[PDB]
Write a protein that binds this ligand. Structure first.
Ligand code: FE
Ligand code: FE
Ligand code: FE
Ligand code: FE
Ligand code: OH
Ligand code: OH
Ligand code: OH
Ligand code: OH
Lengths: 238, 202, 238, 202, 238, 202, 238, 202
């Protein structure tokens, strides 16, 4: 198999840069249209991160910053599969997450929300997908939190995630939410996404058979990255 | 066939959650940073720095930037590189940084990349691929950094020539300076407005 | 107005005593049918609790047990109205609540769940409804928790409540849940209630206009007690 | 017209969340308990105690019990009392208790109530109204406690006579005993099975 | 009752500032997003207008400018209630109206429309809502009129209204229309309002039982202003 | 719960229908205007004036402006003022004006307001709340007027500091001038474009 | 992969123990609720049966008891796949079947039904699933038969089956039926299963493309057993 | 995800169709039975026997029983055993039997199992896992057999202690007897009623 370029990103499946309802986007969006280019080696390559570098608790947000006790909040496991748009598993992709604690508070001086800080919670994790594109991490369910867009704006609970995979063209950062959260329908950031089917693609689903008794609940959440097409005639990449 | 997961802004703590060490969150033993030069890395060392400005001309102090580049001989430290050449084994080719909270400057210590093949036998001028994430940015913005001392190569670059408004090509050229023996390329990014930097859909 | 008896409790609107899916009910339910009686002064009277006895933080579960800091978890206000079945407000009724903390852990040695304890959270509160039957309290949203019915059983988040009002016949203890919680559809305890419309009557609704910016979310939850009928002909009570 | 809010079990911590003081949760200054006798309360002091048993005959150690009764002259300390008589001003008429965690015994210190009017000019025998809550009990169970030394009054009691199986009436009669000068009425409750206590829908 | 802030204005329930179909908005709309602030005494207060200052014909546009005869056109009474979003009546609010005459002509040199002027019609009125939030005025039904947006643009008949109530944050100016006017579906100004349910909220309804025989027709039109929330815990206003 | 009635533009005759007297429509005996100073009003008299400009830089001659402010001691002549201080009894605190048809200037004769409490024990700098209505403006635009001779107070003002682009704060500061003994504050409003005035959602 | 416990059996997907319409269950059902336990090595292990022990005709009910001729009745092949609830194949599971002959008569003195015995039919078979969880056996289609529940009760045609697989917790005995049999809708034993979707899960489907010309018909029938979950954090089994 | 195939009763011939040999149906050469002891099997031989009774107290003569157990050292002859110990190679660990048609007794010849690890480092007391199938039983009933001569181990057993009604734990203890040199454990099972045997959902 000789690989060609990544399929074109479908702009209608993503938020536009300028989205007036999310006020901070007004001064941080280009006024010119993006210039599309034909891909070269630069866009179809990406770095490799070796497993050797990761610690044993890197994907365990419950214990990786625990000092005297366990963090307070709902114990949850989140797992799922990373695949490309043609359904192929994405192997050894770097998945990084960051989030607030159970009160909706981030661990930084910049966050001044009255929600209480948890001395035993850090809120950062990372993992590599396996050969089937599978990933799993454990954490405390984040609390929703207020922010100033309109004065009484509130984000639904969410976990921020980032992926570095096989090609630079696949680089993606987003946020996933939890099935049933009522704030999901009111969030101006989630509403920047044009279609309802794509908004639903960011909702992690309750996976009841995978709860661990007297221990943790579990959510299922799959991620799809852009896929490369195979070449059977002229290979112009180079 | 599946649709790509939709992007969302990195949000206000993207430069903290992806660089915990800097935010004094010591959860990882090995931390990713903005230094691509290891001791045996080959090539000429350079420092790339600048600021990112919003539409009012103010620098963003909550931006997170990553770069991706080739080694000194124009080979990518990636299994998808089909050049059949051996890559410098002491080079990751990727880095991540945030902007200083006060000044607003961001920087990377890296190597000047060599020329990489373009499509259909062409040759691209040396460049560094760059992406920007931040609160208010719904999808990471892609751009490239070229070098002013490579005018000859820049003039025959496929990507630069594919920008029809010749006047905008220059927003992608960083300026070489020499601070006490060190080579520095200044690259300022303007997200909106006059001299708006070119961004690509790649 | 001369008052007569409370309208008959409608047994079809409540769970039955024997409900096999909630295993603990099998040995704690009478095998004989309840014997219905005509009401006397005994059933239409109840005690009075004076406001003087309540402390200032009795309805503030966030601060009433806070020692060195604030409890960890989602700050929420819950308010609503207590009315009788004929729509009349229930005045000066004693409303008591108890609940788990943000991890789903109760503050008692008997609870051995691994969810972490919060040294600044107690989980008990009380208030008197005002003249319009209005009540309001503040708390941390409880986390769902496991329990052993089937081994992997999980209660949705809930707050336990109790009411002592005008007549002993109105005495009621129950539990309310939060709009959107996906565990609500699987709970054997909530499923002891026969009708879907009555299951929905225990779900507290998100009250977005009443959120307090940069502070707390708010849920609306009304309660209905049995009502007395007026007498216009013979008064047999006595 | 509205439907009554549906009942749900008190659950496993009902005897803790409604009696925090006893569970060492010191959130309230004034706490409700099982002592209905204040210093000037009128009437003869009595102690009511017993155990609650499940269908296997084992005592419940997680039950929460409350009682409601009239003062020594058969008047309720309630605004809904229409008797036109003044009530003892040092009597709440209500109390709450849990069962000892080990023994399984529950108790109240109260006063023996006087007779209260029944419907259509009848007279009820002295009684205490009792309700039971616990894990596994979906709706609080109502019952009444009568006294064995009031046989004459019990025989003409409307409610007791409205129980057609005469044999079950006796499950509602507590037994008088005299422990070193104190009068105690033992009342055991059997939720299921042989000698199942009568419960009312009131 | 201690009052807190006004509930946040729901921007989705109002027209956006920039609305290309109403051409004059293109150069008179800010390019920056509005900056939301937490309310202070400045935003929750407003002036008081005393009834003593109003003349007897201030709410009678039929007679308040009549010199030799009555104005020409359809005699109509318009009445309704002003309430806040939580349903509370708005008492002693200043309601001012202005409109064109029966030909669609305003009484100003600037209006050069060929529709005839009416020497006995002025087109300005005002009133204070009573304790139930009720208001009533009498007038001549305005005629629709042309204007230059696209060259053949026509406004449906409308009466302009303004309200100054209890808090500066409630300040509102708008326009209401008359049930059945076919121009309502084509108006670019009414179409700046995003939702159809909100467009319908500006349509005054025929109130047939309230017509006055051999005299005037009547329209019913209610207005809703932002409401304040009550405070039960910390009062941060001050 | 109900939705707020939707706003609509004041339209082309808003500065006529709300100021009939000025448009020579003499329907009311008592008319509202731009003069907030009565004879016994306390405080230092000032004149506030300026122009409102559209995106092409031209002044709007059909704009209607109102202001709302506190008396000389920072108390609002409003029943919602909870300060427990008595307000100047000869002060309405509100006024309305239009722009001159030719020049395009608008003005108010008022008093310089005193400082009003901010939230959580803070103190706001003296300010006047201002709203603008006109054809092409779909919802009244709210802004505030601060004073350049109150630099010290402005620097600690909650609202001004809540504007993150420090450069925009200055659009809210009026300039003090002294015309033949009278104090005048010039406040120009730019609806769109360079130096666009800050508007608030309140 | 480190394996954890079997997912909890979903009691709502199975018949209850006490089912009054199947009269024999009234005295053979426990009155106490089953006690759920957390699994140990005892519950996740099971025996292994070696293929060496099975004869060549063990899965051929047509020939395994044929003495002088072939049994009388409809020649049918039944095949399908055994999988766990997460879709993994169940390998080397012991599948045993037993059934009546074409007249609905079992080969035992206890069966006194007048339906005729077939000297060439035994009615017992067994097999091991292969690596894909596949199984196949051949037999004579059983006839429906009367039994005494209500006096005129009739079982639809059925084949009894039993499975011993990887864990003792998967142990299952049941019965499958044949697509279209009209007795299926009237059977009190099949009606002990609460949901219609689960009743349908016991119906073997006609597999027409797999009939063998001039020979036998074929039915397709898949079986699902409980599945184990994988462990990625603490392994408490031991 | 799929739902588990629903259970159905074994029906009236379950003890015949799963033990054909005994019902004189000679279709298989190798037949499964109730004898777990092979000649080199290690451990002390025991005989486990008893009867199964319905709610009227009558023995079931159509029941089919199977048992599953560990070898003499508490190791399961199963690939899912993670103990890292070698299992007795002459032990299947499973058996099947029916009840005698007249008497109603069932039995197995096996070995007394050794202790098996419990969860989180605990140790279970020796036990045999047992399942019962029969007409009228809609889902196989699971129970366990413990031994009366292992009182010490039984007292610290996790599963037995997880039964809150201590009085029911005893229904799971078989009684040791010694018939002419052979050790026999009598285990009677009561499906319904007084002294109802405990059944587990596993
Ligand atoms: Fe966030
Ligand atoms: Fe609970
Ligand atoms: Fe108009
Ligand atoms: Fe059968
Ligand atoms: O965020
Ligand atoms: O509970
Ligand atoms: O207008
Ligand atoms: O059968």
């Amino acid at each position: 198999i000789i690989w060609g370029a990544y399929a074109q990103r479908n702009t209608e499946d993503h938020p536009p840069a300028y989205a007036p309802g999310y006020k901070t986007s007004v001064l941080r969006s280009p006024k010119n249209a993006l210039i599309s280019i034909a891909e070269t080696l630069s866009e179809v390559t990406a770095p490799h991160f070796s497993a050797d570098k990761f610690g044993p608790k890197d994907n365990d947000l419950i214990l990786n910053y625990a000092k005297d006790g366990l963090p307070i909040g709902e114990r949850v496991i989140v797992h799922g599969y990373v695949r490309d748009q043609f359904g192929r598993p994405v192997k050894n992709a770097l998945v990084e997450v960051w989030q607030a604690n159970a009160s909706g508070r981030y661990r930084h001086p910049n966050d001044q929300y009255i929600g209480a800080m948890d001395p035993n919670f850090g809120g950062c994790g990372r993992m590599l997908t396996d050969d089937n594109g599978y990933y799993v991490f454990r954490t405390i369910k984040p609390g929703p939190y207020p922010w100033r867009n309109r004065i009484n704006e509130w984000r639904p609970a969410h976990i921020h995630f980032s992926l570095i995979a096989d090609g630079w063209a696949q680089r993606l950062i987003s946020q996933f939410y939890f099935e049933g959260d009522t704030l999901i329908d009111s969030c101006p950031i989630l509403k920047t996404i044009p279609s309802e089917q794509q908004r639903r693609a960011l909702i992690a689903l309750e996976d009841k058979s995978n709860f661990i008794e007297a221990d943790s609940r579990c959510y299922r959440f799959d991620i799809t990255l852009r896929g490369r097409r195979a070449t059977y005639f002229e290979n112009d990449l180079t | 066939e599946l649709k790509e997961t939709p992007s969302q802004t990195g949000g206000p703590y993207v430069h903290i959650g992806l660089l915990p060490k800097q935010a004094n969150i010591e959860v990882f033993e090995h931390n990713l940073d903005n230094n691509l030069v290891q001791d045996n890395t080959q090539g000429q060392r350079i420092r790339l720095e600048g600021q990112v400005f919003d539409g009012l001309g103010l620098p963003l102090r909550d931006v997170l930037i990553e770069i991706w580049q080739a080694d000194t001989n124009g080979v990518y430290p990636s299994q998808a590189d089909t050049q059949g050449k051996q890559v410098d084994p002491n080079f990751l080719g990727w880095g991540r940084t945030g902007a200083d909270f006060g000044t607003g400057f961001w920087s990377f210590n890296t190597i000047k990349p060599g020329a990489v093949p373009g499509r259909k036998g062409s040759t691209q001028a040396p460049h560094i691929s760059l992406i920007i994430f931040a609160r208010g940015i719904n999808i990471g913005l892609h751009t490239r950094v070229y070098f002013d001392d490579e005018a000859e190569a820049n003039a025959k670059d496929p990507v630069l020539n594919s920008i029809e408004w010749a006047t905008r090509r220059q927003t992608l050229v960083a300026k070489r300076e020499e601070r006490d023996g060190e080579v520095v390329y200044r690259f300022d990014i303007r997200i909106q407005g006059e001299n708006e930097t070119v961004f690509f859909d790649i």
